[model samples]
Target: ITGTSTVGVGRGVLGDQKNINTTYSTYYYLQDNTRGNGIFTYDAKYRTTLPGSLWADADNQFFASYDAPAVDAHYYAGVTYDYYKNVHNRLSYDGNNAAIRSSVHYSQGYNNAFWNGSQMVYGDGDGQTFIPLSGGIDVVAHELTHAVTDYTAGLIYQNESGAINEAISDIFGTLVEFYANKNPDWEIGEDVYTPGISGDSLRSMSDPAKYGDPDHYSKRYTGTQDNGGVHINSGIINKAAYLISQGGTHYGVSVVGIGRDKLGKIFYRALTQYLTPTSNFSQLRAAAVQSATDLYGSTSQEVASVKQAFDAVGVK
Candidate 1:
């Protein structure tokens, strides 16, 4: 829609107030022209279509219950975009300032959110398992990071390669979570997952085994479900990343914490410079070690922690 750039005030799914970038032609539309090409959020209208319709409102104030998801989806994408631009010196997911688009309210009782290789999509959860997913910035960032992975490593979404892809998303998603400082935790999707169950999350990077996910290679899933357990096996890598950032002793392996900024640097460098479409767990360890060596030299503690974290998780 053609319009002058604008901003709108809205209350999100969790009743939190925030400002969202919008545009004004005849009516306010959830089309943000402030970032890159643009960030557009659409209303899926309880159906399974891509990018449904650009959200429009007669009044610029978005406080109605139905407007909540759109507000968060649009607002969080900008936050994720800034994470790339400010922290990583990249423009959007492609590093080319590509327009980011998203759609919400995708089907009745839908329980998930994902990046379908082109645009982001969010489900307005069944109300039992989840609320509006965009309510969680980490969830939004996690899905957007998939776009980043698709552009960079192009990691094949099956078996070990798929697990790496998943972990990379988790790693960056959490980084963005911390970057925003929204009551940061090492847990994944805790804010938007399991509303009835308190203190629970979809996954835990600090302790993947908290949900019975494998924290080590020996416990990896071998089934064909979930694309060879891409979500399940990613725990091994997630644990390794957590160790690198936070440090811990696992199975007699002790790693010194190098903190999250350096973790992001090592992983970002690896994803851009060393990883490939079919890279597996061992290859990820090598890439991280080499990336750390490149960024901080062979004798750096960052390199040592990279090696120790992977070894601690049995990735060697």
Candidate 2:
């Protein structure tokens, strides 16, 4: 619902700088002009918080409320916005667009958060294992990155496309965490969990080989848990990128080393500028390899090692 109404009908830099004052008024006026434009649409309840009855639970329970810690949600949303803009030069959900809306405190004990194609929604965890979904900036960026992928590649949410979707989210999510702080580690969902568990997490980017649950994707993994095992298969791409960047062995593969900065640039270029939504493993390998070639050279060691890592994953 952003950008030009017609394909290739760009609105110029004005589109990038456009803003609407949505304060307690029903009219809009030019920033320097006095005349006002009458309300295009009316939302009498615009300022009122949405009631809890609007959301539902996984088991059809009506656990709705607006009493979540909104400060954290707002802070995380701002962090996601800044991370995308500063790192990628991406403006909001869609490039050259206003900031997208975020809705938090969706339901009581909702246990999950998602980007429903238009907006990001968060849930308060069950208080047993998980905490509030907005407790971490990575989770916030992860869900919003799905929106970014949707706007760009529109990746299919099954099979390899699904795995790519998950991989891109993890990529930006971890990058956002590190960009937010210099001391940040490359793990996911470790902060929001209950303090009882000693060393458990939702996922591990540094070493997925740990976390013994076969249901979750690890380095020596096999299973069909989610969407042609998209969730599990994501470990391959995660490991591929991690090894390509950090100079380490992936699974049983030998060390094909590359520095982190070059590897990150290649992958980011491939994901944002080259790959498509339905691109499969072969296409992913080609895109990543080609990105490295473009950055370094056709016969660069980084490009060669990237191909080797992909081959070790059976990505041919």
In terms of lDDT, the poorest run of 10 residues in model 1 is 186-195
Give lDDT tens digits, candidate 2, residues 1-316: 1111111111111111112222222222111111121111111122223322221112211112322333344445556767766766777767764445555556667676678766666666777677767666677778878988888777898877888788778767777777777236666767676647856677776665565412122333334567776666676677666667665654466657785556657876887778887998678889998889888899889888888777656576
Model 1 lDDT at residue 184 = 93
Misplaced by over 4 Å in model 1 are none
Task: Look at candidate 2 and tell me the lDDT of residue 50.
Answer: 37
lDDT of 1 by residue, 1-316 (tens): 8889988999998999999999999999999999999999999999998889999998899999999999999999999999999999999999999999999999988899999989999999988899999988889998999999999999999999999999999999999999999789999988888889999999999999999999999999999999999999999999999999999999899999999999999999999999999999999999999999999999999999999999999989
lDDT, candidate 2, equals: 0.59
Instruction: Name the regions of candidate 2 deviating beyond 4 angstroms.
Output: 1-68, 212-225, 256-260
What are the per-model numbers of colliding residue pairs? 0, 0
